[PDB]
């Protein structure tokens, strides 16, 4: 059972250190847009909140280390940072997911590819098209077959 994974990493030349992240990417803004509805009320995707947490706990850590706080605080900060990143990638893989406003879980990146809604399930169900219409039918007996 182990040899399959070990050989998978043994092949293709690529190193296994990719499983630890020294930096994480940020999705372009318009894929997680902030839009003001009619009347001035704003609507925003959940992603730009998850990222925010990762930005917060990281910065505090970069501050906390500078002043040399005891390890009891620095290690808790590191645990928080890692938990925030984990929730950003796959919310709910840790346990009870983060919820934020209301009492609904926040959609992570993986949730945009995993469930019924996503670019791997919803994409194959077709798309709405222009130059199209719909209407009820009646029998035309005088029509030719074509």
């Amino acid at each position: 059972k182990r040899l399959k994974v070990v050989a998978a990493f043994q092949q293709s030349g690529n190193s296994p250190m990719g499983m630890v992240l020294d930096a994480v990417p940020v999705i372009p803004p318009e894929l997680r847009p902030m839009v003001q509805l009619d009347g001035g009320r704003f609507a925003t995707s959940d992603l730009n909140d998850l990222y925010r947490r990762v930005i917060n706990r990281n910065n505090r850590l970069k501050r906390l280390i500078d002043l040399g706080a005891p390890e009891i605080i620095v290690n808790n900060e590191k645990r928080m940072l890692q938990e925030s990143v984990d929730a950003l990638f796959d919310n709910g893989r840790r346990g009870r997911p983060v919820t934020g406003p209301g009492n609904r879980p926040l959609k992570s990146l993986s949730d945009l590819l995993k469930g019924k809604q996503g670019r791997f399930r919803q994409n194959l169900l077709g798309k709405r098209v222009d130059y199209s219409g719909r209407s009820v039918i009646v029998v035309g007996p005088q029509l030719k077959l074509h």
């Binding site: 009891i72 808790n76 645990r79 938990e83 840790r94 346990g95 009870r96």
Partner: peptide, 24 residues
């Protein structure tokens, strides 16, 4: 909730008495 680890870890150090704070 998983804040219990922090509560446990900080729970291994006893509180200071009035005279220890000045010493520290």
């Amino acid at each position: 909730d998983s804040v219990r680890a922090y509560l446990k870890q900080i729970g291994k150090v006893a509180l200071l008495n009035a005279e220890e704070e000045v010493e520290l």
